[PDB]
PDB file of C-alpha atoms and ligand atoms in Angstrom:
ATOM      1  CA  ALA A   1       0.000   0.000   0.000  1.00 55.57           C
ATOM      2  CA  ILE A   2       2.533   2.656  -1.265  1.00 50.46           C
ATOM      3  CA  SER A   3       1.397   6.310  -0.664  1.00 51.75           C
ATOM      4  CA  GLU A   4       1.146   8.358  -3.940  1.00 49.79           C
ATOM      5  CA  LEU A   5       2.359  12.035  -3.790  1.00 52.78           C
ATOM      6  CA  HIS A   6       0.935  14.896  -5.975  1.00 54.82           C
ATOM      7  CA  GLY A   7       2.596  18.076  -7.332  1.00 53.75           C
ATOM      8  CA  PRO A   8       0.892  20.747  -9.528  1.00 54.80           C
ATOM      9  CA  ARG A   9       1.752  18.673 -12.678  1.00 55.79           C
ATOM     10  CA  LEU A  10       3.296  15.362 -11.393  1.00 54.35           C
ATOM     11  CA  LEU A  11       2.020  12.141  -9.738  1.00 56.77           C
ATOM     12  CA  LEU A  12       4.819  10.361  -7.757  1.00 55.27           C
ATOM     13  CA  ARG A  13       3.636   6.698  -7.594  1.00 54.36           C
ATOM     14  CA  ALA A  14       4.685   3.030  -7.188  1.00 56.79           C
ATOM     15  CA  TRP A  15       6.273   1.402 -10.307  1.00 57.48           C
ATOM     16  CA  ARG A  16       4.124  -0.769 -12.688  1.00 60.85           C
ATOM     17  CA  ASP A  17       5.129  -3.537 -15.210  1.00 60.26           C
ATOM     18  CA  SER A  18       4.164  -1.070 -18.051  1.00 64.65           C
ATOM     19  CA  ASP A  19       6.921   1.389 -16.830  1.00 68.47           C
ATOM     20  CA  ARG A  20       9.763  -1.148 -17.527  1.00 70.72           C
ATOM     21  CA  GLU A  21       9.669  -0.666 -21.375  1.00 70.59           C
ATOM     22  CA  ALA A  22       9.811   3.195 -21.085  1.00 66.23           C
ATOM     23  CA  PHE A  23      12.536   3.054 -18.337  1.00 67.25           C
ATOM     24  CA  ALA A  24      14.610   0.551 -20.459  1.00 67.25           C
ATOM     25  CA  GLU A  25      14.574   3.142 -23.347  1.00 64.61           C
ATOM     26  CA  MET A  26      15.845   5.842 -20.882  1.00 65.88           C
ATOM     27  CA  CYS A  27      18.574   3.505 -19.561  1.00 66.85           C
ATOM     28  CA  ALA A  28      19.652   2.736 -23.161  1.00 65.89           C
ATOM     29  CA  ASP A  29      19.921   6.547 -23.876  1.00 63.79           C
ATOM     30  CA  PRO A  30      23.585   7.766 -23.890  1.00 63.86           C
ATOM     31  CA  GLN A  31      22.400  11.368 -23.083  1.00 63.55           C
ATOM     32  CA  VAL A  32      20.440  10.096 -19.979  1.00 62.84           C
ATOM     33  CA  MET A  33      23.373   7.819 -18.885  1.00 63.22           C
ATOM     34  CA  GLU A  34      26.256  10.217 -19.882  1.00 63.64           C
ATOM     35  CA  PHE A  35      27.617  10.673 -16.282  1.00 65.07           C
ATOM     36  CA  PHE A  36      27.062   6.957 -15.337  1.00 62.71           C
ATOM     37  CA  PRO A  37      29.678   4.206 -16.041  1.00 62.98           C
ATOM     38  CA  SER A  38      27.631   2.795 -19.024  1.00 64.84           C
ATOM     39  CA  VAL A  39      24.158   2.504 -20.676  1.00 62.71           C
ATOM     40  CA  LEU A  40      22.094  -0.484 -19.341  1.00 63.91           C
ATOM     41  CA  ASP A  41      20.481  -3.327 -21.391  1.00 65.28           C
ATOM     42  CA  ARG A  42      16.866  -4.488 -20.614  1.00 65.36           C
ATOM     43  CA  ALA A  43      18.167  -7.097 -18.054  1.00 68.70           C
ATOM     44  CA  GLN A  44      20.180  -4.391 -16.144  1.00 66.69           C
ATOM     45  CA  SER A  45      17.260  -1.847 -16.378  1.00 67.05           C
ATOM     46  CA  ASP A  46      14.788  -4.455 -14.942  1.00 68.88           C
ATOM     47  CA  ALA A  47      17.324  -5.276 -12.119  1.00 70.20           C
ATOM     48  CA  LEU A  48      17.369  -1.555 -11.049  1.00 70.37           C
ATOM     49  CA  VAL A  49      13.479  -1.548 -11.044  1.00 68.83           C
ATOM     50  CA  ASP A  50      13.593  -4.755  -8.853  1.00 71.21           C
ATOM     51  CA  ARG A  51      15.840  -2.911  -6.278  1.00 70.70           C
ATOM     52  CA  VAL A  52      13.410   0.109  -6.374  1.00 72.64           C
ATOM     53  CA  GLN A  53      10.394  -2.229  -5.673  1.00 73.77           C
ATOM     54  CA  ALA A  54      12.399  -3.958  -2.849  1.00 73.19           C
ATOM     55  CA  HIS A  55      13.183  -0.508  -1.279  1.00 70.20           C
ATOM     56  CA  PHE A  56       9.425   0.455  -1.395  1.00 73.42           C
ATOM     57  CA  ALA A  57       8.432  -2.986   0.073  1.00 73.51           C
ATOM     58  CA  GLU A  58      10.972  -2.579   2.969  1.00 71.55           C
ATOM     59  CA  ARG A  59      10.742   1.206   3.748  1.00 77.10           C
ATOM     60  CA  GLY A  60       7.326   2.389   2.338  1.00 76.52           C
ATOM     61  CA  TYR A  61       9.170   5.044   0.215  1.00 80.53           C
ATOM     62  CA  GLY A  62      11.706   5.033  -2.661  1.00 82.92           C
ATOM     63  CA  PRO A  63      12.539   6.619  -6.046  1.00 82.02           C
ATOM     64  CA  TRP A  64       8.850   7.196  -7.123  1.00 82.67           C
ATOM     65  CA  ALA A  65       7.889   6.649 -10.809  1.00 83.96           C
ATOM     66  CA  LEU A  66       6.920  10.076 -12.335  1.00 83.37           C
ATOM     67  CA  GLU A  67       3.484  10.192 -14.082  1.00 83.39           C
ATOM     68  CA  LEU A  68       2.332  13.461 -15.780  1.00 83.50           C
ATOM     69  CA  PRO A  69      -1.520  13.282 -15.786  1.00 80.88           C
ATOM     70  CA  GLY A  70      -2.898  14.766 -19.068  1.00 79.98           C
ATOM     71  CA  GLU A  71       0.421  14.081 -20.895  1.00 74.79           C
ATOM     72  CA  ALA A  72       2.430  10.857 -20.155  1.00 74.99           C
ATOM     73  CA  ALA A  73       2.215   7.650 -18.008  1.00 78.68           C
ATOM     74  CA  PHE A  74       6.007   7.558 -17.226  1.00 75.17           C
ATOM     75  CA  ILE A  75       8.738  10.263 -17.665  1.00 74.31           C
ATOM     76  CA  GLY A  76      11.323   8.710 -15.237  1.00 73.78           C
ATOM     77  CA  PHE A  77      11.807   8.686 -11.418  1.00 74.57           C
ATOM     78  CA  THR A  78      12.581  11.065  -8.503  1.00 74.01           C
ATOM     79  CA  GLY A  79      12.666  10.124  -4.768  1.00 76.84           C
ATOM     80  CA  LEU A  80      14.499   8.853  -1.662  1.00 81.30           C
ATOM     81  CA  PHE A  81      17.027   5.984  -1.206  1.00 81.50           C
ATOM     82  CA  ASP A  82      18.550   5.003   2.195  1.00 87.72           C
ATOM     83  CA  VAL A  83      22.399   5.371   2.176  1.00 84.00           C
ATOM     84  CA  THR A  84      23.880   2.183   3.801  1.00 82.81           C
ATOM     85  CA  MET A  85      27.275   1.955   1.933  1.00 80.59           C
ATOM     86  CA  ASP A  86      30.650   2.697   3.675  1.00 75.35           C
ATOM     87  CA  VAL A  87      30.808   6.551   3.256  1.00 76.58           C
ATOM     88  CA  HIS A  88      31.505   9.321   5.866  1.00 76.61           C
ATOM     89  CA  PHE A  89      27.856  10.644   5.640  1.00 75.12           C
ATOM     90  CA  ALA A  90      26.162   7.190   6.172  1.00 74.72           C
ATOM     91  CA  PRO A  91      23.740   6.345   7.562  1.00 77.44           C
ATOM     92  CA  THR A  92      21.283   8.835   5.906  1.00 78.16           C
ATOM     93  CA  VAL A  93      18.684   9.163   3.066  1.00 77.91           C
ATOM     94  CA  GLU A  94      19.684  10.415  -0.444  1.00 76.91           C
ATOM     95  CA  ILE A  95      17.463  12.042  -3.148  1.00 76.07           C
ATOM     96  CA  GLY A  96      18.021  11.038  -6.834  1.00 77.82           C
ATOM     97  CA  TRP A  97      16.345  11.834 -10.206  1.00 78.16           C
ATOM     98  CA  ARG A  98      16.334  10.513 -13.832  1.00 80.11           C
ATOM     99  CA  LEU A  99      14.062  12.110 -16.525  1.00 76.37           C
ATOM    100  CA  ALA A 100      13.484  11.248 -20.224  1.00 77.25           C
ATOM    101  CA  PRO A 101      15.319  14.024 -22.173  1.00 76.83           C
ATOM    102  CA  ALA A 102      11.981  15.119 -23.809  1.00 79.96           C
ATOM    103  CA  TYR A 103      10.912  16.478 -20.327  1.00 84.53           C
ATOM    104  CA  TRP A 104      14.221  18.355 -19.546  1.00 82.42           C
ATOM    105  CA  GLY A 105      14.030  22.182 -19.133  1.00 79.27           C
ATOM    106  CA  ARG A 106      10.434  22.248 -17.701  1.00 78.10           C
ATOM    107  CA  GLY A 107      11.199  22.347 -13.907  1.00 77.15           C
ATOM    108  CA  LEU A 108       9.700  18.792 -13.677  1.00 74.34           C
ATOM    109  CA  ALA A 109      12.759  17.353 -11.795  1.00 72.11           C
ATOM    110  CA  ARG A 110      12.593  20.498  -9.560  1.00 67.65           C
ATOM    111  CA  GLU A 111       8.827  19.903  -8.865  1.00 66.09           C
ATOM    112  CA  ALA A 112       9.316  16.105  -8.317  1.00 71.61           C
ATOM    113  CA  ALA A 113      12.202  16.838  -5.843  1.00 72.47           C
ATOM    114  CA  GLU A 114      10.145  19.510  -3.926  1.00 73.60           C
ATOM    115  CA  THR A 115       7.292  16.892  -3.614  1.00 76.57           C
ATOM    116  CA  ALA A 116       9.785  14.177  -2.429  1.00 77.67           C
ATOM    117  CA  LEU A 117      11.562  16.529   0.090  1.00 77.28           C
ATOM    118  CA  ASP A 118       8.168  17.830   1.443  1.00 74.94           C
ATOM    119  CA  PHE A 119       7.399  14.093   2.138  1.00 74.19           C
ATOM    120  CA  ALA A 120      10.933  13.523   3.597  1.00 76.13           C
ATOM    121  CA  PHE A 121      10.630  16.431   6.131  1.00 75.42           C
ATOM    122  CA  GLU A 122       6.818  16.771   6.787  1.00 74.30           C
ATOM    123  CA  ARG A 123       5.751  13.044   6.662  1.00 74.15           C
ATOM    124  CA  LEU A 124       8.909  10.946   7.475  1.00 77.52           C
ATOM    125  CA  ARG A 125      10.346  13.807   9.682  1.00 76.45           C
ATOM    126  CA  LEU A 126      13.940  12.987   8.474  1.00 74.30           C
ATOM    127  CA  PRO A 127      16.669  15.182  10.068  1.00 73.83           C
ATOM    128  CA  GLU A 128      18.554  15.499   6.699  1.00 75.68           C
ATOM    129  CA  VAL A 129      18.494  14.407   3.007  1.00 75.60           C
ATOM    130  CA  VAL A 130      21.734  14.267   0.911  1.00 76.50           C
ATOM    131  CA  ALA A 131      22.469  14.050  -2.845  1.00 74.64           C
ATOM    132  CA  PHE A 132      25.787  13.280  -4.643  1.00 75.93           C
ATOM    133  CA  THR A 133      26.996  13.309  -8.284  1.00 73.05           C
ATOM    134  CA  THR A 134      30.245  13.842 -10.320  1.00 74.93           C
ATOM    135  CA  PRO A 135      31.600  17.384 -10.996  1.00 73.69           C
ATOM    136  CA  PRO A 136      30.859  17.210 -14.789  1.00 76.03           C
ATOM    137  CA  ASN A 137      27.111  16.408 -14.134  1.00 75.45           C
ATOM    138  CA  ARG A 138      26.204  20.146 -13.826  1.00 76.30           C
ATOM    139  CA  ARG A 139      22.441  19.596 -14.638  1.00 74.69           C
ATOM    140  CA  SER A 140      22.336  17.324 -11.509  1.00 73.85           C
ATOM    141  CA  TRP A 141      24.291  19.458  -8.937  1.00 69.36           C
ATOM    142  CA  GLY A 142      22.673  22.583 -10.504  1.00 70.48           C
ATOM    143  CA  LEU A 143      19.263  21.148  -9.415  1.00 68.65           C
ATOM    144  CA  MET A 144      20.704  20.274  -5.924  1.00 65.17           C
ATOM    145  CA  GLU A 145      21.778  23.930  -5.234  1.00 65.45           C
ATOM    146  CA  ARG A 146      18.526  25.367  -6.801  1.00 66.81           C
ATOM    147  CA  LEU A 147      16.529  23.151  -4.310  1.00 68.03           C
ATOM    148  CA  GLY A 148      18.522  24.968  -1.533  1.00 66.64           C
ATOM    149  CA  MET A 149      20.863  21.998  -0.765  1.00 64.25           C
ATOM    150  CA  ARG A 150      24.480  23.153  -0.002  1.00 62.10           C
ATOM    151  CA  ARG A 151      27.917  21.568  -0.773  1.00 59.90           C
ATOM    152  CA  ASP A 152      31.090  21.585   1.394  1.00 57.99           C
ATOM    153  CA  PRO A 153      33.928  20.767  -1.091  1.00 60.13           C
ATOM    154  CA  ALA A 154      35.897  19.335   1.933  1.00 60.24           C
ATOM    155  CA  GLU A 155      33.270  16.477   1.888  1.00 61.02           C
ATOM    156  CA  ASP A 156      34.281  15.367  -1.684  1.00 64.41           C
ATOM    157  CA  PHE A 157      34.597  11.517  -1.516  1.00 65.12           C
ATOM    158  CA  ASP A 158      35.654   8.445  -3.588  1.00 63.76           C
ATOM    159  CA  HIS A 159      32.591   6.155  -4.190  1.00 62.03           C
ATOM    160  CA  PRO A 160      33.179   2.892  -2.233  1.00 60.94           C
ATOM    161  CA  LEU A 161      31.310   0.720  -4.870  1.00 59.03           C
ATOM    162  CA  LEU A 162      33.763   1.795  -7.664  1.00 57.98           C
ATOM    163  CA  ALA A 163      37.462   0.801  -8.209  1.00 56.01           C
ATOM    164  CA  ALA A 164      40.111   2.880  -6.300  1.00 58.03           C
ATOM    165  CA  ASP A 165      41.501   4.064  -9.729  1.00 59.42           C
ATOM    166  CA  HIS A 166      38.045   4.462 -11.466  1.00 62.12           C
ATOM    167  CA  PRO A 167      37.936   7.731 -13.516  1.00 61.81           C
ATOM    168  CA  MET A 168      34.344   8.541 -12.263  1.00 59.41           C
ATOM    169  CA  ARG A 169      35.159   7.717  -8.561  1.00 58.94           C
ATOM    170  CA  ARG A 170      35.296  11.365  -7.283  1.00 58.50           C
ATOM    171  CA  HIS A 171      31.806  12.523  -6.077  1.00 59.91           C
ATOM    172  CA  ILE A 172      30.610  15.846  -4.506  1.00 58.98           C
ATOM    173  CA  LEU A 173      28.088  15.888  -1.587  1.00 57.97           C
ATOM    174  CA  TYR A 174      25.053  18.217  -1.134  1.00 57.28           C
ATOM    175  CA  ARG A 175      23.047  18.301   2.147  1.00 57.48           C
ATOM    176  CA  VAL A 176      19.742  19.912   3.225  1.00 57.59           C
ATOM    177  CA  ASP A 177      18.392  19.549   6.817  1.00 55.92           C
ATOM    178  CA  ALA A 178      14.781  20.038   8.087  1.00 60.19           C
ATOM    179  CA  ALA A 179      15.588  23.613   9.345  1.00 61.86           C
ATOM    180  CA  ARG A 180      17.086  24.775   5.974  1.00 64.17           C
ATOM    181  CA  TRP A 181      14.170  23.158   3.997  1.00 65.07           C
ATOM    182  CA  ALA A 182      11.512  24.811   6.275  1.00 62.43           C
ATOM    183  CA  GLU A 183      13.345  28.218   5.999  1.00 62.01           C
ATOM    184  CA  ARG A 184      13.328  28.410   2.124  1.00 59.22           C
TER     185      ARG A 184
HETATM  186  C1  COA B   1      19.449  15.940 -13.732  1.00 61.05           C
HETATM  187  C2  COA B   1      18.119  16.179 -14.463  1.00 61.05           C
HETATM  188  C3  COA B   1      16.993  15.443 -13.718  1.00 61.05           C
HETATM  189  C4  COA B   1      17.824  17.677 -14.439  1.00 61.05           C
HETATM  190  O1  COA B   1      16.571  17.939 -15.131  1.00 61.05           O
HETATM  191  P1  COA B   1      16.225  19.448 -15.545  1.00 61.05           P
HETATM  192  O2  COA B   1      14.965  19.443 -16.349  1.00 61.05           O
HETATM  193  O3  COA B   1      17.441  20.080 -16.133  1.00 61.05           O
HETATM  194  O4  COA B   1      15.948  20.106 -14.110  1.00 61.05           O
HETATM  195  P2  COA B   1      14.863  21.136 -13.534  1.00 61.05           P
HETATM  196  O5  COA B   1      13.596  20.396 -13.269  1.00 61.05           O
HETATM  197  O6  COA B   1      15.491  21.902 -12.418  1.00 61.05           O
HETATM  198  O7  COA B   1      14.661  22.109 -14.791  1.00 61.05           O
HETATM  199  C5  COA B   1      15.512  23.279 -14.840  1.00 61.05           C
HETATM  200  C6  COA B   1      15.440  23.896 -16.213  1.00 61.05           C
HETATM  201  O8  COA B   1      14.061  24.208 -16.531  1.00 61.05           O
HETATM  202  C7  COA B   1      13.811  25.573 -16.287  1.00 61.05           C
HETATM  203  N1  COA B   1      12.725  25.645 -15.308  1.00 61.05           N
HETATM  204  C8  COA B   1      12.768  25.464 -13.940  1.00 61.05           C
HETATM  205  N2  COA B   1      11.587  25.586 -13.376  1.00 61.05           N
HETATM  206  C9  COA B   1      10.721  25.855 -14.431  1.00 61.05           C
HETATM  207  C10 COA B   1       9.333  26.085 -14.498  1.00 61.05           C
HETATM  208  N3  COA B   1       8.524  26.078 -13.441  1.00 61.05           N
HETATM  209  N4  COA B   1       8.799  26.318 -15.721  1.00 61.05           N
HETATM  210  C11 COA B   1       9.611  26.325 -16.786  1.00 61.05           C
HETATM  211  N5  COA B   1      10.923  26.117 -16.846  1.00 61.05           N
HETATM  212  C12 COA B   1      11.418  25.889 -15.620  1.00 61.05           C
HETATM  213  C13 COA B   1      15.129  26.204 -15.840  1.00 61.05           C
HETATM  214  O9  COA B   1      15.281  27.485 -16.405  1.00 61.05           O
HETATM  215  C14 COA B   1      16.175  25.216 -16.364  1.00 61.05           C
HETATM  216  O10 COA B   1      16.520  25.444 -17.734  1.00 61.05           O
HETATM  217  P3  COA B   1      18.094  25.212 -18.057  1.00 61.05           P
HETATM  218  O11 COA B   1      18.526  23.916 -17.398  1.00 61.05           O
HETATM  219  O12 COA B   1      18.218  25.145 -19.569  1.00 61.05           O
HETATM  220  O13 COA B   1      18.819  26.417 -17.483  1.00 61.05           O
HETATM  221  C15 COA B   1      18.209  15.662 -15.909  1.00 61.05           C
HETATM  222  O14 COA B   1      19.153  16.438 -16.640  1.00 61.05           O
HETATM  223  C16 COA B   1      18.577  14.188 -16.016  1.00 61.05           C
HETATM  224  O15 COA B   1      17.706  13.336 -15.865  1.00 61.05           O
HETATM  225  N6  COA B   1      19.845  13.892 -16.277  1.00 61.05           N
HETATM  226  C17 COA B   1      20.311  12.548 -16.597  1.00 61.05           C
HETATM  227  C18 COA B   1      20.262  11.609 -15.411  1.00 61.05           C
HETATM  228  C19 COA B   1      21.190  12.032 -14.291  1.00 61.05           C
HETATM  229  O16 COA B   1      22.373  12.282 -14.515  1.00 61.05           O
HETATM  230  N7  COA B   1      20.667  12.109 -13.062  1.00 61.05           N
HETATM  231  C20 COA B   1      21.419  12.534 -11.891  1.00 61.05           C
HETATM  232  C21 COA B   1      22.402  11.487 -11.428  1.00 61.05           C
HETATM  233  S1  COA B   1      23.442  12.080 -10.070  1.00 61.05           S
END
């Protein structure tokens, strides 16, 4: 019984079998996956969706599927994922987002994130939500700072689930706490 969340334009909902085709197309898109190690095949796409469903089943929240009523059934995901890996800022909850390029430049990731963080702070009453990306992924960390999240460059970290010499290992960390979120 996953709780659906509404924004002006977006419905943040549980994933459905019919989303897997659309999400597979996104995951096969080199523009969507530019700042990730590689594009995913259908098998790898479906495996990510399985982890999302598992997260929802365990925690009652997760990276929500993004529906746009009056327009499109599925445009990607935005939502929360518990951080359990061996990093300095664990344990905590992260926020992440992936949109079909057709829906870029419309403030839809912004709106989805505002809906997710409202849930995070008003409903779950989390003390903090984090987000991390690579320096070249400016669309991603641009959104983080526009949402009012803030980065300390001293908190730059090597991702523990990548090789020690991996060229995409260096990540930057953004944080927003309940006070900062309530204040903006
Ligand atoms: C990261 C990502 C979600 C950002 O999406 P986005 O559409 O650029 O983000 P926003 O929702 O903040 O939209 C901002 C843009 O829309 C505009 N905008 C913002 N609010 C708006 C509104 N209410 N109405 C109209 N336009 C609006 C802004 O001017 C901006 O345009 P610009 O980027 O050309 O300057 C998207 O690029 C993506 O999915 N990237 C690939 C996957 C990825 O790397 N994810 C992150 C992994 S760490």
